C-alpha cells in the first residue's frame, strides 16, 4: 500500500538486511540514505514574544 520503491534494487542480495521478530519482518535497503522530514515543523513560525 505504501509503495514499492524501497525494495527496488539492482542487487538485492547485498543490499537487503532483515530480522524476523515474532510476527513481522523489518527490512533495510542498505543504499537508501535516511533523510529528515522538512516541512513538518511543530509550529511553522510561532513568534514566541
Amino acid at each position: 500500500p505504501n509503495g514499492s520503491n524501497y525494495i527496488k534494487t539492482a542487487n538485492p542480495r547485498n543490499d537487503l538486511r532483515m530480522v524476523t521478530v515474532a510476527d513481522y519482518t523489518f527490512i533495510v535497503n542498505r543504499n537508501v540514505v535516511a533523510q529528515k522530514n522538512t516541512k513538518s515543523v511543530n509550529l511553522p513560525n510561532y513568534n514566541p514574544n
Partner: protein
C-alpha cells in the same frame, strides 16, 4: 457608617480543588490513541481470522 450585615455577608474566595503541576514526559502511558503504544512482541503479533 458602613452596613451591619454587609460585613458578615462577605465571604472569602472559594476553594480551588486541583493544583497545576508540570508533567514530565514518560508519565503518560497506555492511552486510547490508535498510535502504536503497545510494546514488546505483543504489538507486533496480529491475530488470524
Amino acid at each position: 457608617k458602613m452596613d451591619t450585615n454587609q460585613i458578615r455577608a462577605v465571604e472569602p474566595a472559594p476553594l480551588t480543588q486541583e493544583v497545576s503541576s508540570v508533567e514530565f514526559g514518560g508519565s503518560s502511558d497506555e492511552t486510547d490513541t490508535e498510535g502504536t503504544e503497545v510494546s514488546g512482541r505483543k504489538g507486533l503479533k496480529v491475530e488470524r481470522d
